[PDB]
Design a protein around this ligand. Structure first.
Ligand SMILES: CCCCNC(=O)c1ccc(SC2CCCCC2)c(S(N)(=O)=O)c1
Ligand SMILES: CCCCNC(=O)c1ccc(SC2CCCCC2)c(S(N)(=O)=O)c1
Ligand SMILES: [Zn+2]
Ligand SMILES: [Zn+2]
Lengths: 240, 240
């Protein structure tokens, strides 16, 4: 219903590691200023599409020499009972959930200038899987989904280490150019997808996919977009 | 006193093919609409820093899937009798001359919005070397230099196959991120430097270096910038 969602270079995509092109040029992700103090607080919001944390100024990220970004927000994608809800897949496998940290190039002053422009926005993405332990970092956010279950509801939460939400090795990722996965589906987004996953307890994953309400009288669930063709794009890998 | 001319990531650079990262993601260049009709004519100008050919609308160049560009102009860098004048070097070797074909990202309607923006401008570069035969395509430009010997003069030339000023091998090239090499030296420029060189006659190379006059009572020669340090950038290659 936005023609942009029918462009040729959309996200998400199915990742095929063996077909990823290794390039030495893809150096380790640099994330500075992500260890936020408890004050000030941050806005967490149920928009009926996802849960969205607004991030402060000062979160700086580089994809390479002279290619720098500042973090804007983070949100999540998830499924339902017995059904996975990641956006990206790996060899056809859909993981339980998926975190997206959205950034704006320092070469643009406004997001509306950056939409549609090559490298204007960059998203860091990581897969969330079931493990045995309870995740501390994720609990800070999952604990407050109760408060904001309505739709439009919002709360304030204490500062947290945003970088603790992400996987172990910042030198191991896949990378491609695609689009926003929501309308306006703008192209020129650089997607970086960690090779390693983060682990949540089955308790936490049930919570995430069963606490929030979306449009009208309906649970917010399966908020991922279908897989989109690569159409000739080659996914790059930072490791052989 | 134009600040980006003092940036960390400038052009040109010395290329060391041993140290280039092989990146299978780098596909062959697609050029469309470069085979021009004779009419309308094109403007060829001695701007006192180079000879520049203004290219018409409709020349599309892609660095790959979703990496789309339009050609603006081309110009040349050269030396002097017994002196090489290429901008880029290879293992410290300087070639007799160099052609630059400057392009604008389709995401931008004008150069000034692209400047300093990531991938906003893209240059196709090829070395010129001495061969035994008169180069046909080059002769159409070089035969007119006498008419534009004076600083700030110009002339009209018939359209030609612009892609015949370049190497026939479009699959094999180095690519790196850098800058314009003249003020304002804005960064974010994708430079693509062909592996194959182009052949001009000794007479042609002499015409290029010995015909034009620049500022002062001065010959327009040796119009190349010094090489700039990589400063931790990696150059990619399209071939193993
Ligand atoms: C049907 C479910 C829709 C849920 N998606 C989002 O809420 C969402 C909201 C925002 C964003 S990014 C944002 C940045 C610029 C303006 C609009 C989109 C993204 S994404 N996956 O990063 O493209 C997703
Ligand atoms: C020694 C005197 C300088 C010689 N250089 C040029 O004339 C020249 C003139 C123009 C250009 S491109 C750029 C000029 C300003 C904005 C539009 C494109 C470039 S380049 N090598 O591709 O950056 C070079
Ligand atoms: Zn998202
Ligand atoms: Zn040039």
């Amino acid at each position: 219903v936005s023609p942009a969602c029918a462009g040729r270079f959309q996200s998400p995509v199915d990742i095929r590691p063996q077909l990823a092109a290794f390039s030495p040029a893809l150096r380790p992700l640099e994330l500075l200023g992500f260890q936020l103090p408890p004050l000030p607080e941050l806005r967490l919001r149920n928009n009926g599409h996802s849960v969205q944390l607004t991030l402060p100024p000062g979160l700086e990220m580089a994809l390479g020499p002279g290619r720098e970004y500042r973090a804007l927000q983070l949100h999540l994608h998830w499924g339902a009972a017995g059904r996975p809800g990641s956006e990206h897949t790996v060899e056809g496998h859909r993981f339980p959930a998926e975190i997206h940290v959205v950034h704006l190039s320092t070469a643009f002053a406004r997001v509306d200038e950056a939409l549609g422009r090559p490298g204007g926005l960059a998203v860091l993405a990581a897969f969330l899987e079931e493990g045995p332990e309870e995740n501390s970092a994720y609990e800070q956010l999952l604990s407050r989904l109760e408060e904001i279950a309505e739709e439009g509801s919002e709360t304030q939460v204490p500062g947290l280490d945003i970088s603790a939400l992400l996987p172990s090795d910042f030198s191991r990722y896949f990378q491609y150019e695609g689009s926003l996965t929501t309308p306006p589906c703008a192209q020129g987004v650089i997607w970086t997808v960690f090779q390693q996953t983060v682990m949540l307890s089955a308790k936490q994953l049930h919570t995430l996919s069963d606490t929030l309400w979306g449009p009208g009288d309906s649970r917010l669930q399966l908020n991922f977009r279908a897989t989109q063709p690569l159409n000739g794009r080659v996914i790059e890998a930072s490791f052989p």
